[PDB]
Design a binder for this molecule. Structure first.
Ligand SMILES: CCS(=O)(=O)n1ccc2cc(C(=O)NCc3ccc(NS(=O)(=O)C4CC4)cc3C(F)(F)F)ccc21
Length: 321
């Protein structure tokens, strides 16, 4: 396994981007700035195996707690977690740190964020990479309800819409929540089908799940502590802005993303499947690719060595000049 991170041994940074919104991050290394942006429901610590490797490779790594998570502010309002707001906060973040650009690397919902940073704020994005999450143009004549409603692997996302409902389930037992979610693809205890009909993500999963081969008890306990601070409302709110996000995305008009870009697919991610990235080169002329076999949704901890190799090779060729 690559070198990991001990939270107590990190430099912790805090930037107040607006009076009630402060973003926390950890920072390691010297060199071009690289901002890592985690997904749902994760932490800066999801990048624990990349942070040392990227610093050693000659980068200044900034690994965020995204809005709603960890030591970052978690306002309760849904609209505080739309992509327009979140992106403009990340621009302010760069402004406050005095960074003209950074490389943005995201996974999951953080991958969605870094694509829209590249699309709308390219002057601030040196280069962009996404783990798992594709860049899909907005169709200015089609409702975000129709698309998700089709693919049955997206049913749990409907369960996540009504405020308070999934929160109660996810907050009931945090240790069970993280052990149930953070599993390799072959170790899954969840069906992402008729979650609503089942009446919950965990209705039919072990009350005392085993520990995945991917994670230690101590690592699970770090997530548990973190989610004691603000719980799951802020995190879930990222899923509750589909219409708002679509309307914003439509404002890009025809425009392409013309900066250096990297799309990394994960063979065993059965939600964010590799095929969803097909034809991204139509919108992103300088796209490069990587692909990780035997890799489920939790890319950084499932295949940390492979992630590190792919990102370092791409950073050295395409982000440093
Ligand atoms: C085309 C972009 S998009 O489709 O709108 N999109 C962009 C980002 C994005 C994220 C999620 C998400 O649920 N991510 C969380 C997630 C994502 C995946 C899985 N598990 S799985 O069943 O896919 C496994 C890989 C086999 C579980 C979970 C969860 F909810 F439990 F945390 C879903 C959709 C997302």
């Amino acid at each position: 396994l690559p070198t990991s991170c001990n939270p107590s041994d990190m430099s912790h940074g805090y930037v107040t981007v607006k009076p009630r919104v402060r973003l926390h991050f950890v920072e390691l290394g010297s060199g071009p700035a690289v901002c890592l942006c985690h997904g749902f429901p994760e932490s800066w610590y999801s990048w624990r195996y990349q942070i040392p490797a990227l610093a050693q490779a000659g980068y200044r790594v900034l690994a965020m707690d995204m809005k709603g998570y960890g030591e970052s502010s978690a306002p309760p309002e849904i609209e505080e977690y739309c992509m327009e707001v979140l992106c403009k906060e990340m621009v302010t973040f760069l402004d406050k740190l005095g960074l003209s650009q950074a490389v943005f690397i995201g996974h999951d919902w953080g991958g969605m964020l870094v694509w829209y940073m590249a699309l709308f704020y390219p002057e601030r994005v040196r280069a962009v990479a996404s783990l798992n999450t594709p860049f899909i143009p907005a169709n200015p004549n089609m409702s975000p309800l129709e698309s998700i409603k089709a693919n049955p692997v997206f049913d749990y996302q409907l369960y996540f819409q009504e405020p308070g409902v999934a929160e109660a389930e996810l907050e009931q037992n945090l240790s069970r929540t993280f052990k149930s979610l953070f599993r390799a693809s072959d170790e899954s205890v969840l069906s992402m089908h008729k979650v609503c009909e089942a009446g919950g993500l965990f209705v039919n999963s072990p009350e005392e799940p085993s520990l995945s081969r991917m994670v230690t008890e101590e690592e699970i306990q770090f997530y548990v502590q973190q989610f004691k601070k603000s719980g799951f409302r802020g995190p879930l709110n990222w899923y509750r802005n589909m219409e708002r996000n679509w309307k914003w995305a439509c404002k890009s008009l025809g425009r392409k993303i013309l900066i250096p870009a990297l799309m990394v697919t994960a063979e065993k991610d059965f939600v964010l499947v590799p095929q969803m990235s097909q034809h991204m080169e139509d919108w992103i002329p300088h796209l490069k690719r990587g692909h990780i076999e035997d890799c489920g949704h939790w890319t950084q901890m499932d295949k940390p060595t492979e992630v590190n190799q792919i990102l370092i090779k791409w950073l050295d060729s395409d982000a440093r000049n």
